[PDB]
Structures are given as C-alpha cells and as structure tokens.
Curated annotation (Swiss-Prot):
Principal localisation: membrane
Membrane topology listed for this record: Multi-pass membrane protein
Superkingdom in the source lineage: Eukaryota
Segments crossing the lipid bilayer: 9-33, 44-67, 79-101, 122-144, 175-199, 316-339, 348-371
Residue ranges of coiled coil: none
Native species: Homo sapiens
Residues the record marks as carrying a glycan: 155
Family: Belongs to the G-protein coupled receptor 1 family.
Keywords, alphabetical: Cell membrane, Disulfide bond, G-protein coupled receptor, Glycoprotein, Membrane, Receptor, Transducer, Transmembrane, Transmembrane helix, Ubl conjugation
Cystine pairings recorded for this chain: 72-160, 75-147, 78-167, 340-343
Protein name, as recorded: Adenosine receptor A2a
MF (Gene Ontology): alpha-actinin binding; calmodulin binding; enzyme binding; G protein-coupled adenosine receptor activity; identical protein binding; lipid binding; protein-containing complex binding; type 5 metabotropic glutamate receptor binding
Cytoplasmic compartment spans: 34-43, 102-121, 200-315
Function (record text): Receptor for adenosine. The activity of this receptor is mediated by G proteins which activate adenylyl cyclase.
Amino acid sequence: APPIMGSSVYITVELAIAVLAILGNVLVCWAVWLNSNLQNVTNYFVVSLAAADILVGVLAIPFAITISTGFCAACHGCLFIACFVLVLAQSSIFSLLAIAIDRYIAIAIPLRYNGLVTGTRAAGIIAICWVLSFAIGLTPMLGWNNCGQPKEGKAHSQGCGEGQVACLFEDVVPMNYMVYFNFFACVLVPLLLMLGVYLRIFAAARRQLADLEDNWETLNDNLKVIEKADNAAQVKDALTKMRAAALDAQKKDFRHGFDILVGQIDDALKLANEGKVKEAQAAAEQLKTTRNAYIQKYLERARSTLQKEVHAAKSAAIIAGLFALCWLPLHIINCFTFFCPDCSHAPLWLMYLAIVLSHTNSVVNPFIYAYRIREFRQTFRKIIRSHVL
Ligand SMILES: CC(C)CCC[C@@H](C)[C@H]1CC[C@H]2[C@@H]3CC=C4C[C@@H](O)CC[C@]4(C)[C@H]3CC[C@]12C
Ligand SMILES: CC(C)CCC[C@@H](C)[C@H]1CC[C@H]2[C@@H]3CC=C4C[C@@H](O)CC[C@]4(C)[C@H]3CC[C@]12C
Ligand SMILES: CC(C)CCC[C@@H](C)[C@H]1CC[C@H]2[C@@H]3CC=C4C[C@@H](O)CC[C@]4(C)[C@H]3CC[C@]12C
Ligand SMILES: CCn1c(=O)c2c(nc(/C=C/c3ccc(O)c(O)c3)n2C)n(CC)c1=O
Ligand SMILES: CCCCCCCC/C=C\CCCCCCCC(=O)O
Ligand code: NA
C-alpha cells in the first residue's frame, strides 16, 4: 500500500483542524478587544488560552505533519520540532489552573477579590507562566534526549547525510520524560488540583445558598412564635434570634430595609423588657411589611447572583474537562508503549487518531463561550453581522 495515500488523509484532516482553530480563536480575541464588558481578569487568561490554540494551528500542526514523514535533519533541530507542542500544552494547563483559582476567590472571598486580583498582576502572571512553559516543554533540548544514540540503519536507509537522523518523535524524545515527567508530574497532577478546586467551589456555593435560606426561615418562624405567644420572655427570645439572623444576612436601599428591620426589632424588644407584651406583639406585625418590601428583594438578588457565578464556574469546568478528554488517549498510549515492552506497539492509524484528537481541543473552546456565555455570544454576532455585511 502506497504510504502517500494514508498520509493524504492524515494531512488533510490536520489542515482542516488548523483552519478552524485559527478562525474560532481569532474571533475570541477580537471580541475581548471590542467589548469592554469582557475586559476583566478572568478573560485575560481566556485570551492567553486562545493565543496558545492559535499557535497550534500556525506552528504545532505544521510541525506534526513534518515529523510524520521521517525526513533527515540534525537531531537537535528535530527535537525542537517535536517538543514545541509540549510548550503550548503546558501553557494551556497553567491558564486553566488560573481560571479555576480566579473563580474560587470570586465566590469564597468576594470582598477582597477586586483588591487582590488586578489587571496588572494578571498580565505578570501570564508572562511568568509562558516562560515556565518553554522551560518545561523544551527540557529535552537540555540533554534529556536520544540524540546521543541515533538509529543509523534508519538514517542510512533514508539516505541521510552525516550528522543527521530520520526525524521521528519516538526516536528522539525519551519515553521516560514523556511518561514520568510530562504526563504524571506536569499534566496529571495539575489536572487533579483543578478537580479539587472546582470541588471546593461547588461546595462553598451550596453552603452559602443554604445559609441564606436558613436565615430566611429563622426570621419567618420566630415571627409566628411572637404572634401565638403568651409571656414577655418568649417574645424576647424570638426577637433576639431574629436580630442575629438579621445581621448574619447583611453579609443602600438594602441598608434602608435593614436599617428599618433592626430598628423595629429594637423597639419591640424594649417593650418586652419593660413587660408590655401586647404592645410588643403588635409592634412585630410591622416587621412583616418590612420583609415583604425590602428583605425578600435582597434574598432574591443575592440568590440570583450566586446562581450566575455557579453557571460561570460550570462553564470553566467544562473547558477543563474537554482538555482532559482530548489529551488523555495519547498519554495513555504512551504508557502502554513505555510500561509494556512485551505488548505490540499501537498501530499507526491509532497513533494518528490520538494525535488528531489532541489537536481538536484547539477548536472547541469558542463554541463553549458562544453556547454558555451570553456576552460572548452577542459580541460574536455583532462581529459576524457587521463584517459579513
Ligand atoms: C516566528 C516563526 C514564524 C518562525 C518559525 C521558525 C521555524 C520555522 C524554524 C526555526 C528553527 C528551524 C529548524 C532549525 C534546524 C533544523 C535542522 C535541519 O537539519 C533541518 C531544518 C530544521 C529542523 C529547522 C526547521 C525550521 C525551524 C523549526
Ligand atoms: C480517555 C478515555 C477516552 C479512554 C481512552 C482509552 C484508550 C486510549 C485505550 C483503551 C484501549 C487501549 C488499547 C488496548 C490494547 C492495546 C494493545 C497494545 O498492544 C497496544 C496498546 C493498545 C492498542 C491500547 C491503546 C490505548 C487504548 C485504545
Ligand atoms: C485519572 C486516570 C486517567 C489516571 C491515569 C491512569 C493511567 C496512569 C493507568 C490506567 C490504565 C493503566 C494501564 C493498564 C494496563 C497496563 C498493562 C501493563 O502491562 C503495563 C501497565 C499498563 C500499560 C497500565 C499503565 C498505567 C495506566 C495507563
Ligand atoms: C503529545 C506529544 N506527542 C507525542 O507524544 C507523540 C507524537 N507522535 C507520537 C508518535 C508517533 C509515531 C509512533 C510510531 C510510529 O511508527 C510512527 O510512525 C509515529 N507520539 C508518541 N506527537 C507528535 C505529533 C505528539 O505531539
Ligand atoms: C499561517 C502560516 C502557516 C505556515 C505553514 C503553512 C503550511 C505548512 C504545511 C506543511 C509543511 C510540511 C513541509 C513538508 C516537510 C518535508 C517533506 C519531506 O521532506 O519529506
Ligand atoms: Na489549548
């Protein structure tokens, strides 16, 4: 079978993926530049992620096509072509980790968020992560490689010049680097951390919603205790529990409804301590009207805000999960190649499928923003309509 036939299918699919990765991710960068509502710290890591996916199409995919032919080259030039995609993958992992951490600070410590994370600190984090991605991804160029033990029967068979090798990924890149150092330490470990962070995000959002409902019930229940009461101290008990639940839900038109709320509680408590119970019970049914006009409005707005952040955290978790789905097959195949020297090597068509799948990850993110983030979707339309004209 002419190898150029099967090679044509692999090359054609890769070029198709490159065009889509470039187009969709250029659109993401254009949206963030145009719409000032999208220019926040979270979306700067989105742009950093988009830039890495753009470079997959412009450089990594052409590099992959080149190395599939086994052309003769100087071994260290082959190493750079083979290892550059590892830089872009490491950059993606760092950007995903930052987005998870940024979303956790937003829900856990919302008050200091705007003081903690700033636009100028995010840019410096992004630059540091990119430098580290080059260091991790190009570590084979520092000596941990197979350039010292060339396959010379292959180089002679392909007619390579002196000092050249047949440029093949598994011939120059050691598999102990790929498995122990790249997969376990630099990919799997950061992915598990992301898993734990998102676990803390959804647990903390659940507890906050429950606390709000508990205070809402604590307020309403102790109101009925007052109505159907008989002694002055019972009135005092129910009221004091309301004052605590009133201050533990305060964490300007809201401050009014809370200024009134704590005020009416204070009036009714003074009546009970003096002993006038009937006057206290009646000074309480006014607390009702306060809740049906101010408190319930706050409880709804706070509840609607929390759900908006959970939605935004769910969207980021889908992006991280799709990364794992597209990259794990290739990594798992490397484990079989490395750990089972008695097993037959995975066939070539499966290698190409796992490689293509890892490249598909650079296409999917712009579809997630359009489906799940309304501000992205509207901005997308505006660009397409005003430039398809
Ligand atoms: C800024 C961007 C567009 C520049 C892209 C630079 C790329 C195309 C260059 C930089 C380093 C180059 C490599 C350096 C050394 C060798 C070894 C030689 O025996 C074959 C060519 C090969 C493998 C080169 C291929 C092209 C290469 C990868
Ligand atoms: C990450 C999710 C989608 C799971 C993916 C599992 C894939 C990558 C697994 C499941 C079955 C696996 C195959 C099972 C058996 C063999 C035969 C062996 O001689 C070479 C490896 C090879 C060919 C494995 C390659 C990896 C493989 C295809
Ligand atoms: C969260 C999950 C994805 C963690 C990753 C699981 C990986 C590290 C596990 C799952 C399946 C495992 C493989 C299953 C079977 C064998 C065959 C044996 O002869 C050598 C080890 C080898 C090849 C294992 C290597 C490690 C392996 C690839
Ligand atoms: C994520 C890193 N990474 C890899 O880990 C990888 C790989 N290409 C191979 C393997 C190729 C191959 C194997 C056996 C063959 O007979 C053959 O002809 C080709 N691997 C193991 N790419 C390059 C496209 C890659 O990006
Ligand atoms: C937007 C800029 C894109 C730059 C890349 C342009 C397209 C590159 C396509 C594939 C180049 C493959 C080169 C062939 C390798 C040498 C073949 C061989 O020696 O057998
Ligand atoms: Na990516």
